Amino acid sequence: GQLGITSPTTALDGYRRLRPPVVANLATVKFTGS
Amino acid sequence: QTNPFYDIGGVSLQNAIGANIQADGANELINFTTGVNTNA
Amino acid sequence: MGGAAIGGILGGVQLVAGISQANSQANAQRQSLQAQAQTTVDASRIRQMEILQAR
């Protein structure tokens, strides 16, 4: 599952490792107005 | 396989020297006994 | 054939086998390093081609 843009150009020590600060959802806006 | 080795001792010593020569031209023997790398 | 030549050649082949075994280990190490380097270069070249296509 590749969040964000998925266009056909993107296809191609001893300490605790914390997960990167990445979110799982992104904001989208749909404009039905004029 | 040379007279000095016969003078040192036995004929089997010539056999060992010939075996070393046929193996690597006594390269390992020279390196291990004298410390000189004939073929560096 | 004979009685002494057989023993001499048997001893000689034993010694040659040992020395060649050591040399074979060395050459196997050589070839493994060669293959590793070639694989790394090939992978880098493939990724470079992918980058060029994307560009």
Local structure of residue A17 (DSSP, 8 states): P
* Number of CB pairs, chain A paired with chain C, less than 8 A apart: 5
Interface residues of B toward C, Cβ cutoff 8 Å, are 11-12, 15-16, 18-20, 22-24, 28
In units of Å, what resolution does this entry have? 3.4
Residue type, A3: L
Q: Do B22 and C20 touch (CB under 8 A)?
A: no
Residues 6+ apart with CB under 8 A from C49: none
Q: Do C11 and B28 touch (CB under 8 A)?
A: no
∠ CA(A24), CA(A28), CA(A34), 5° rounding?
A: 175
Q: Do B23 and C8 touch (CB under 8 A)?
A: no
Say if CB B30 and CB B36 are below 8 A apart: yes
Q: Quick one: tokens of B25?
A: 């031209």
Q: Distance between CA B2 and CA B16 in Å, rounded?
A: 11
Say if CB C11 and CB B16 are below 8 A apart: yes
CA atoms within 13 A on the CB side of C46: 7
CA C15 to chain centre: 20
Closest chain B residue to C17 measured between Cα atoms?
B23
